[PDB]
Subunit: 352 residues, 4 copies
């Protein structure tokens, strides 16, 4: 019974070709605290992240995810999960080289995403002047930007959603709370080891790419903060993809923006739907279900980015939107033909 | 100085070919109180509308606005406004035939919209069991749907925005707070006689049509109520056009839906930007300004309805969206008349 | 490792001497669905409660909690927890007499609270016309009142908080996320088996009573809905105890009211602080810590009800408030002397 | 017909004996822009204040209101209002000595409050990098604190509420939208020249004092910003008096705090009830009406500060709360018990 072996998503690393601008996004707009700098990397936490960092920004020639690490529910759970992966012929490596954390198992998803498992995590203790009167809160909410509380979840792009889902289910004990299917093909899976709808999702890469990041998400817990965040991004020249609105899938209040390095960042409002029922069936969204899945309100997710752009991208975001909006390309048409039309021409999709 | 002669938008009448479904939308979803029924009409108010009705639903073979009435700030202001219109060769009629109101001056905008001015308005008094402990609140907030407080504003579609704007400015003393221009052509004007951004707007009908209703708006004052409303509309099968989001123009939180009779209804969240500065210049939105004007967030206003559909429509809403989403030489004529920064804005979906 | 054996709080039963008024509170104000009636009981769920009921209202001569049931994470977990309790000399009984559920283990807390454990629970299926387009949502959000999504948590009053806490920790595998201490005495414990701050809390009965209910809580997930709920309760004559505000303890947005039968009901806004860190130390609130624990904002929790009234009460709520506000009683003064003054004269207490 | 002669509340000046801490409160917590410094004063605006300042912070030995200025609807309206006041034997002064503004009429309320009228007001224009894409918004919302949009309203404490009300009604053309009465005594009056419930209120000073400031208020327009603001104030050691909640009177979402200099500041959420009906009767709140007037929710307004403390105060805030938790008893006997022992009052 692996169900309870993974506790939560501890941290993630973003690659940025504009590391200072990425850093300024996370500090000046999202009010994250800087806890460490070393080499070409800067380490940040939200004010309610429990460990010394949840986000690592690393200078790189391209955008994308350096890794994501999940924290286990015990040291024994870490041994059981690492052994399951090894016995499943997954190549792993043991490391202990990150500030604030100990012994870490590194491996790749079936599509090449860098994933990590750990137990050993230091509990962040604030300097006295940053301690909160709220005792569950390890540091005061900053006075900068619209500050995020913590990391929320990860959305991976895969050439094969089922292979990534089966890895999380079989080796990590995750359940799939919700998925989107087109005939017999899984094009999205939302997975969790706890009450959350998901901490890890996987969506089909319609461009044939491998091992990409769709988005990293941070948590506000309040829908208004997405309204405040989008008004900030609009007036301070950050590109907005879609939202604020509410996904039918997970019932999460969402806002998607592009940080200056080109990674897609999601801001999450109200937690939404907690999976208290311990043996709920997977909810499967068909193409007849699909419209509400994307957005309860009037929001339209752009075809030319949402369904096709992740990081690293062989094209700039501008070049990507150009190509997939046809500003035809055989690649763009291949993507269009692989996607079912109820999804492609949904009232919750706009095609530039 | 006509600046202060119009107090507010008192009421509007919608025509509906599905009058019971229209009624059910306003009572079951928007929790409006029914205060009267007469002939082919039902009369409603939101719980903070001050007079016995703000909304009249009238059975008709087509959708659209039967009329809108503005209340003046005094009986003398009513005489001054009616005289200004008469002296400007606007042909008006005096009537006194509506429940809850008295003497009314009826006239047409330059584009044929049925407009009215009145002073005499009964103050709604609730039955004892519906009185509020909040003394400015004339009736308890209902326990039905996501209830609207009151009427908010009117958006008129016109072949000629400037002619409609000039009428409100010159004859009613309105100021234009904000407008959208493309070269020398005004494609929208937002007009007010008070601190509100607007109680009356006028937007260019890009199909060349005349005298249509773009939308009637009702007020919540809370952005969350647009979120609650859109979830209600989504799960109870009302068509949603755009929002919830926030218009840069007026800084209003908006949600646009179609009531079953085909009229566009807007739900307004937070009041937004109050015009306290008594001599602010008109803010002119160009096509370089335009994206934020439509929506601060990621909302996309559909080309195929928002810019082209109003009531009455020579086409059904489904037939309209079919035609303007495609080609039709009429749809292409509309596309060529609209500037591309507006047409291909990141705040427009085709 | 019992940590993961309990999944969540499935349901609770309230006793009411005004059963029809209690039912009207939960249906007309809180928009709960009625799924079953049997004997002198009615069974209700919120629109996102997974089983056919989360709330049972039972006619009785006094208010209070008939029982609360927790659902296990497997059938094996139910056998393990029942065996732990039996091996600990706790008297249990096996039953299967409730609509929508199967085999149930009934036992009493160390202070006499009726607690139950079960695995077998039917999944509620709505009639076709009440199914949601939101596939995690088993039934549409109703158009009545400010509807609650689901049951949230339980707050038990005990003569001995530690005895109740040790039962949940040792027999059910709960962790204590937060607690309030006065010297060496635990006067509150907040306990969870999952990411929630708590599904079960226990607070010290300062009157020397045993086995009472402090409150049952339902979930909105949205702070505005506590604002909407309190405005509804205010204008429709429900007694409001405190809030809306936010507890420092759990970081939960709260509103406390009394349902007409005399039970204290809490409405919860935003989920607040999720316990993602699997081995966080218990956070201990002292009397120097205390003010923020009660309320982040300006809310004052009334001494004369919050700290002293639970159900069943030897007095009516009005008689209770009379006695503990001294409208002195040696019993009221005994309660005052047992409570530390930092708690009693906190800026978060009136 | 003076009804339309006053447009809005342009600005106010606060006195502070802790001028730097007061400044830090308005910049670090409330995100106000500093536009000028001169002598012992600093000038600030919210990002949607139309003129170069709405707030002036002035070093002084005691807290309180230096002045409040209302903007008229025309230059002629300024001449008419000034003439009405002088014809009523009110002592007025003409001045033109403030940054961002021109010709000003200064006078005192019947109770000694420093009030001003002006027409001439410069329109603030942001530097290019601070201009908003929202064209009605003259400067970007700052990235600092929970920033206020603009000044909202003023609440004056008076030994005689009726005398202050009569001045605003008869000389400035304000209407009283709502008031609280006890028998034939006005305990509160909420006054407006526009759709707002009020831009000026006056409440009875139960201590027998004269000419005090109860509070100055700033606008968010969003209830959540009061929630965000109170959490900020709680964790950064600002004293919170009451709220967040909603006043039945005006239907305004409110939060009351003390800035470090001792002045009471109110943060306003949703605008609430707009007075569109041009000839609504004044709504009179009795002592049977009273509970909802104070707070729709569970909020309790503290007797020991809310009903008795204003600036300048002969006592520190701490000394005031100490005393009001013969003078305290005189205050208690003058206040009717339905107000004093309301479920919306804490002692
Ligand atoms: C399209 C549905 C969905 C749901 C939850 C997410 O966090 C997300 O990015 C997308
Ligand atoms: C397109 C800008 C705009 C602004 C305010 C409105 O009420 C509206 O309907 C439209
Ligand atoms: C006194 C702190 C507290 C915290 C959370 C609750 O749900 C509650 O009822 C009380
Ligand atoms: C006590 C009622 C009330 C109403 C509006 C306010 O601005 C205020 O400060 C007080
Ligand atoms: Ca296709
Ligand atoms: Ca064009
Ligand atoms: Ca039974
Ligand atoms: Ca004591
Ligand atoms: Ca003089
Ligand atoms: Ca008294
Ligand atoms: Fe996501
Ligand atoms: Fe509108
Ligand atoms: Fe509780
Ligand atoms: Fe105020």
């Amino acid at each position: 019974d692996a169900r309870f072996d993974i506790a939560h998503l501890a941290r993630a690393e973003l690659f940025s070709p504009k590391p200072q601008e990425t850093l300024d996004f996370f500090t000046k707009f999202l009010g994250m605290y800087v806890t460490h700098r070393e080499g070409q990397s800067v380490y940040l936490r939200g004010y309610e992240d429990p460990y010394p960092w949840s986000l690592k920004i690393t200078e790189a020639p391209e955008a994308g995810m350096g890794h994501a690490a999940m924290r286990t529910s015990s040291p024994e759970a870490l041994e059981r999960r690492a052994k399951s992966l090894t016995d499943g012929n997954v190549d792993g490596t043991w490391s202990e080289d990150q500030f604030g954390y100990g012994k870490t198992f590194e491996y790749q998803s079936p599509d090449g995403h860098n994933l990590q498992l750990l137990w050993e995590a230091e509990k962040y203790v604030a300097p006295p002047e940053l301690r909160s009167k709220i005792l569950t809160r390890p540091s005061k909410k900053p006075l900068q930007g619209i500050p995020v509380k913590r990391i929320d979840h990860l959305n991976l792009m895969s050439s094969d959603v089922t292979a990534v889902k089966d890895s999380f289910e079989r080796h990590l004990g995750f359940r799939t709370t919700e998925r989107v299917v087109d005939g017999n093909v899984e094009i999205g899976a939302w997975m969790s080891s706890n009450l959350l709808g998901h901490e890890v999702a996987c969506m089909r890469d319609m461009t044939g790419g491998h091992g990409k990041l769709h988005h990293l998400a941070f948590f506000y817990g309040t829908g208004q903060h997405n309204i405040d965040a989008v008004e900030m991004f609009r007036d301070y020249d950050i590109q907005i993809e879609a939202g604020p609105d509410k996904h039918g899938i997970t019932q999460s209040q969402f806002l998607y923006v592009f940080e200056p390095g080109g990674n897609r960042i999601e801001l999450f409002g109200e937690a939404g739907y907690l999976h208290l029922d311990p043996d709920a069936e997977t909810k499967t969204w068909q193409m007849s279900d699909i419209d509400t899945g994307l957005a309860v309100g009037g929001a339209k997710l752009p075809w030319e980015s949402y369904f096709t752009y992740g990081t690293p991208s062989p094209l700039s975001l501008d070049q990507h939107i150009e190509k997939y909006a046809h500003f035809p390309d055989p690649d763009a048409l291949a993507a269009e033909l692989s996607v079912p039309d109820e999804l492609e021409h949904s009232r919750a999709v706009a095609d530039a």
